[PDB]
Amino acid sequence: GSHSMRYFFTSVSRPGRGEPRFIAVGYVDDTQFVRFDSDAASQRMEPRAPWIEQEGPEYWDGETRKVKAHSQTHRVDLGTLRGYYNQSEAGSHTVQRMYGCDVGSDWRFLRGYHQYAYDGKDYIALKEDLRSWTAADMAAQTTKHKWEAAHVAEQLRAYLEGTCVEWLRRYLENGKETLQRTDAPKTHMTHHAVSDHEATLRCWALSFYPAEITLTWQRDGEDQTQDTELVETRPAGDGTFQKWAAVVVPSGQEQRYTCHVQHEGLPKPLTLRWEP
Amino acid sequence: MIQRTPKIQVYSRHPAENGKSNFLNCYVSGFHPSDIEVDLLKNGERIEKVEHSDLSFSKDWSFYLLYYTEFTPTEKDEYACRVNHVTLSQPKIVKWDRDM
Amino acid sequence: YLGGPDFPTI
């Protein structure tokens, strides 16, 4: 299947005292592999997956230098943005940045992205061609003109089409035992009688990876959304994910209903039915 | 700007069985800004030693965090997650239900 | 592997 490498950065200003809180995380697919937190003691980029621990000191030093540089740029940006938006020095504000690359099943470049937000709203983002920018408002439009004059998209494009892909492939190979493993959902259904006349069937999907999944209910072979509830996919904490979907049915008619589970780890979708 | 209130799920890592060690999770998501207070509670009292994931965010820029601790469920003990955020005028408590 | 070493400011 396809894969991605993505970095997420958050900086939150601290008007009362000191520097912004800065947190950076890096992911391959749904697996976190590095972190930086400006409040942690190490002041280093830190491994979060075993397969990254084999990189050598040259790697960690470079990632630490780069991540600190990113934090400094976000600190500057917080100041500049506070002035662009005519805001007080009293309030805390947030900059978020995400960038990375996707590869196809062939492990060749599919798409790149680089997006920036201020106070939780789009500010500026690279277009899919990696040559042009989308500015959300007139402040970001001044940024776009600056960045176009400085040819920043060309430098980012070189990273996103080239370096990013090369390193993603290295990590996929080095972390093969997990990163190339698909953990199909472990499924079951539970039954709960609300009254003598209606019952809730809950379809569980447990311990799966990657996080993408679809759970559908059908009645007599037709999709049913009324009388259903679907929770947001959630982390188990061990690197896998969980989800459930439930339907309310007339007691005695449970066997009409089927739960359909689609996931990359399943050669064909699973169908569950209460006749337990 | 936009303030978005946290969604909250409280659940075990593994199917719960009385006397068997497990992990209690409180997953908070969909919130902005990122500052948030989260406690896990046993019979109303705060659990010490709770850990959390590194801050990250979703496609719509909202944040998410997992808070968790080892625990050993029993028939009697009750567990919950308590959350405060700038969007909440009081902390929000969500009780653990082993079937959700 | 992060981008860098330069990322201009806004």
Author numbering:
A (entry chain A): 1 to 276
B (entry chain B): 0 to 99
C (entry chain C): 1 to 10
From the paper:
We also solved the structure of each unligated APL to investigate whether structural changes occurred before or after binding — which, combined with an in-depth cellular and biophysical analysis of the 1E6 interaction with each APL, demonstrated the molecular mechanism mediating the high level of cross-reactivity exhibited by this preproinsulin-reactive human CD8+ T cell clone. Competitive functional testing revealed that the preproinsulin-derived sequence ALWGPDPAAA was one of the least potent targets for 1E6, with only the MVWGPDPLYV and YLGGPDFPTI demonstrating a similar low-activity profile in MIP-1β secretion and target killing assays. The potential requirement for a larger degree of induced fit during binding to these weaker-affinity ligands is consistent with the larger entropic penalties observed for these interactions.
We demonstrated that the TCR from the 1E6 T cell clone bound to HLA-A*0201–ALWGPDPAAA using a limited footprint and very weak binding affinity. Here, we solved the structure of the 1E6 TCR with 7 altered peptide ligands (APLs) determined by our previously published combinatorial peptide library (CPL) screening, 2 of which mapped within human pathogens. Concomitant with our global analysis of 1E6 TCR binding to the APLs, we observed a common interaction element, consistent with our previous findings, that utilized TCR residues Tyr97α and Trp97β, forming an aromatic cap over a central GPD motif that was present in all of the APLs. Ligand engagement is dominated by peptide interactions, but hotspot-like interactions with the central GPD motif enable the 1E6 TCR to tolerate peptide residues that vary outside of this region, explaining how T cells expressing this TCR may cross-react with a large number of different peptides.
